[PDB]
């Protein structure tokens, strides 16, 4: 029984092995603990928004939406319909980015590196969409607790449509490389099997549930924004292993394309942030012409808006699973407490059970199928 | 509604079993993957010829910071400290006093570029469009010290980039 | 795409799909980088009367 400390995303893993078998796997984390939750207590809500971009870096837009939903619930306001549609469209784009990252990396670690490049070209195109809508490629801060910061430029919808009508062929090429390959199946089939009861008790969420046959998806069960106005299917696994989760993720990307199509065709007119200048800042022209607009701009950018006292737990169906925020407001313009719930935390806590009686090389596959991003896990 | 990803049962007739045996022995799907790679070899690559060719950008893109001025040549900044107040990283340091002619102007305006997160909150909090995030992104440095911008550096950046900055603002200001 | 017909046929046969219909390289089909100005309408609270803040 030999003990190996595979040290330095960045992960330290202490294992005891009996021969080739993995007897015990112990992850040591905190190599990316930056104390986000303590730092948030020294910021206004607007000032605290950009930390959520950095929490789960792979899918920045979704974290913005979760934080904005929590703050909106505490504020007792609702965003305008066009803002909600933009939020859902960019959340599905965000899902595609996360899925491409998760699938390609899983394949790359497994030793297949070709689809990483093939799909990172598409990732670059989606980064272009991000940059055109917000000015930043990845750390966007676009989705705000009153709606969105800016309206779409006049040619963005057409370019998104042009991109999205060619992506299914890219997914088909990825599948041609992966799904029926016997080496890929031997690397993934019957690896990291988790039962439904164990997945529920261990706090798993997202695909980590749906690969075991659990029919659960927050966008269907507890819809937020306009997800109740779009039609899509929830892919469900049957064996609870890595292969079924890969299929579910691939299927999810196709579903995301479907939802993006619906969002494009049903984008409504109107304003992009709530018409309430005590929450959302006014327009520049109004700020430079009206006394009330200038006062509200000054106060919203110096003190910030006050949130009525209370605590909420708001969760959304993130690309990596259920992503949640427990937000406690004391009545001032700075949050009293912000606890961030990350799906990867519970998934990595379950890695020990998932890797019981497997090869050392199976641990890499299980880590890849758990979809672990370190920034969210450590916070 | 929901979908099954892996709920297919293989056929057990002799023809299907022989097809699967032929796949097992003659390596058919591996040849399919080889064909996919071969097809990808013969298409045009997506590489651009940097630095002679550049990636696409938007008027909304946020780059190196700059301090702008009015067409008369007087600076726009009136030392309200709204950008300093809103800065999520506390990267802005401002000190101000009345000028020799009584104007409300800054004597110190520093941005720690190694603390900045390039969020652009300062340029949207500014009431007079004084601090902006200009289009330049190629300003890497050999030392940490040259990334601690004072007021002179930011005014020089503004005078250097004003043409492009004003064009970008003209393009994007109707969205703000 | 500036590809010869023979190379297009070879890549189409190798992949098993028609590549020309769905190309992964952008061309003139994308929107112009210079756009007309927008107008950006106002929200529901921009009324001149019957708009007391205590009711919203």
């Amino acid at each position: 029984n030999l003990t190996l400390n595979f040290g330095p995303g960045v992960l330290r893993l202490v294992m005891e092995l009996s021969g080739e078998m993995v007897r015990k796997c112990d992850p040591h984390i905190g190599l990316l603990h930056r104390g986000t939750e303590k730092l948030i207590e020294y910021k206004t809500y607007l000032q605290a928004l950009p930390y959520f971009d950095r929490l789960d870096y792979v899918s920045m837009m979704c974290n913005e939406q979760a934080y904005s939903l929590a703050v909106e619930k505490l504020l007792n306001i609702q965003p305008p319909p066009r803002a909600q549609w933009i939020r859902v469209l960019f959340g599905e784009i965000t899902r595609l980015l996360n899925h491409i990252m998760a699938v390609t990396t899983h394949a790359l670690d497994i030793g297949a590196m070709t689809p990483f490049f093939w799909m990172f070209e598409e990732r670059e195109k989606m980064f272009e969409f991000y940059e055109r809508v917000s000015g930043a490629r990845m750390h966007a801060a676009y989705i705000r607790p009153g709606g969105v910061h800016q309206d779409l430029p006049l040619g963005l919808l057409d370019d998104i449509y042009e991109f999205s009508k060619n992506f299914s062929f890219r997914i088909d090429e990825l599948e041609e490389m992966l799904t029926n390959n016997r080496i890929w199946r031997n690397r993934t089939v019957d690896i990291g099997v988790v039962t439904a009861e164990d997945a529920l008790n261990y706090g798993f969420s997202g695909v980590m549930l749906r690969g075991s046959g659990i029919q659960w998806d927050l966008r269907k069960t507890q819809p937020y924004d306009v997800y109740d106005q779009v039609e899509f299917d929830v892919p469900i696994g049957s064996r609870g292993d890595c292969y079924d989760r890969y299929l579910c993720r691939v299927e999810e990307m196709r579903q995301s394309l479907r939802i993006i199509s619906q969002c494009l065709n049903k984008m409504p007119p109107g304003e992009i942030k709530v018409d309430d200048a005590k929450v959302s800042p006014p327009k520049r022209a109004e700020m430079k012409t009206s006394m009330e607009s200038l006062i509200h701009h000054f106060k919203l950018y110096t003190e910030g808006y006050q949130v009525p006292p209370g605590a909420t737990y708001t969760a959304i169906e993130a690309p990596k699973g259920e992503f949640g925020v427990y937000l406690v407001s004391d009545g001032s313009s700075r949050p009293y407490r912000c606890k961030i719930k990350a799906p990867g935390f519970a998934h990595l806590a379950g890695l020990d059970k998932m890797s019981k009686g497997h090869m050392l090389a199976d641990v890499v596959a299980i880590i890849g199928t758990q979809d672990i991003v370190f920034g969210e896990v450590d916070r | 509604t929901y979908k099954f990803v892996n709920m297919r049962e293989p056929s057990m007739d002799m023809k299907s079993v022989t097809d699967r045996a032929a796949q097992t022995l003659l390596w058919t799907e591996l040849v399919r993957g080889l064909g996919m790679t071969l097809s990808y070899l013969f298409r045009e690559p997506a590489t651009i010829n940097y630095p002679f060719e550049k990636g696409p950008l938007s008027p909304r893109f946020r780059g190196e910071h700059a301090l702008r001025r009015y067409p008369s040549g007087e600076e726009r900044c009136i030392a309200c400290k709204l950008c300093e107040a809103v800065c999520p990283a506390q990267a802005i340091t401002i000190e101000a006093e009345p000028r020799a002619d009584g104007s409300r102007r800054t004597t110190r305006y520093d941005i720690d570029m190694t603390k900045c997160i390039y969020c652009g909150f300062c340029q949207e909090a500014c009431p007079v469009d004084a601090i902006v995030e200009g289009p330049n992104f190629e300003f890497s440095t050999e030392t940490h010290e040259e990334l601690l911008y004072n007021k002179e550096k930011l005014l020089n950046n503004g005078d250097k980039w004003e043409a492009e900055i004003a064009a970008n603002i003209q393009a994007d200001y109707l969205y703000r | 795409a500036s590809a010869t017909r023979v190379i297009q046929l070879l890549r189409n046969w190798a992949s098993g799909r028609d590549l020309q219909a769905k190309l992964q390289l952008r061309y003139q089909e994308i929107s112009k980088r210079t756009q007309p100005p927008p107008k950006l309408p106002v929200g529901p609270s921009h009324k001149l009367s019957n708009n007391y803040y205590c009711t919203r």
Binding site: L154, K165, D172, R258, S261, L264 | - | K39
Partner: peptide, 29 residues
Amino acid sequence: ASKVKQDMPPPGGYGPIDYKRNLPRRGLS
């Protein structure tokens, strides 16, 4: 005077977008 102009889908909507898996069988017994 001038009417509203923002980014909207074209009249009649956009064309259909493929999303189903396409893995054709080349064909050989």
